[PDB]
Amino acid sequence: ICQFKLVLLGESAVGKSSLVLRFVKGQFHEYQESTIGAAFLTQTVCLDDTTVKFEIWDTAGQERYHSLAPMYYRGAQAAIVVYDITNTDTFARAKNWVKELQRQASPNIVIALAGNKADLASKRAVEFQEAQAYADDNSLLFMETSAKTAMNVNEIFMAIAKKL
């Protein structure tokens, strides 16, 4: 049995709450309310002979809550920095979340990068290749996801668990 602390960070509206909701409850709400501060959820999965329990901190992406982020990532063993593939700005913002983690978070924290809303292919702004190269250059576990279709949602959390 294993337990890990996980934190989600990213610009507001990229889909952090939706990703957690899909993984923890298998639900997706087209009408999701912006998070105020942070929400907490847990999920237990079966991973190669080991039962892993995830303690997830879903932070509010709005800038006015930025100063509170350390409270959630300081003791985190893993982080998922989320961006919206349809918005280049959210990708740039995700890079700064990564820089912050790499500089102020645990030196041994596993950092994942999630290009969310990948189901909106006809509105893509960030090419998969660019995000992959960025992730490879910064040693980030990258995956394009979709809380809406569930694409790679379970996969990203599981890949993180395997590396912990």
Ligand X SMILES: Nc1nc2c(ncn2[C@@H]2O[C@H](COP(=O)(O)OP(=O)(O)NP(=O)(O)O)[C@@H](O)[C@H]2O)c(=O)[nH]1
Cβ proximity to Mg ion: between 16 and 22 the closer is: 16
According to the annotation, is 123 in a ligand binding site?
Answer: no
Cβ proximity to ligand X: between 5 and 117 the closer is: 117
According to the annotation, is 122 in a ligand binding site?
Answer: no
The correct pick among 35, 145, 146, 152 for binding Mg ion (CB under 5 A) is 35
Residue 41 is a binding residue for ligand X (CB under 6 A): no
- State phi, psi for 46 to the nearest 5 degrees: -100, 120
Residue 148 is a binding residue for ligand X (CB under 6 A): yes
The correct pick among 8, 11, 14, 17 for binding Mg ion (CB under 5 A) is 17
Residue 81, classified by CB atoms within 10 Å of its CB into exposed (0-12), middle (13-18) or buried (19+), is: buried
Residue 147 is a binding residue for ligand X (CB under 6 A): yes
Q: How many CB atoms lie within 10 A of CB 116?
A: 30
The interface with ligand X within residues 98-137 (CB under 6 A) comprises 116-117, 119-120
β-strand partners of 113: 81, 142
Q: How far is CA 84 from CA 105, 139, 148, in A?
A: 23, 20, 13
Site string for ligand X, 65-104 (x = CB under 6 A): ----------------------------------------
Would you say 91 and 74 are in contact if contact means Cβ atoms under 8 Å apart? Answer: no
- How far the first Cα of the chain sits from its last, in Å, is 13
- Indicate the DSSP class of residue 81: E
Residue 18 is a binding residue for ligand X (CB under 6 A): yes
Q: Which does 87 bind (CB under 5 to 8 A by kind): Mg ion, ligand X, none?
A: none
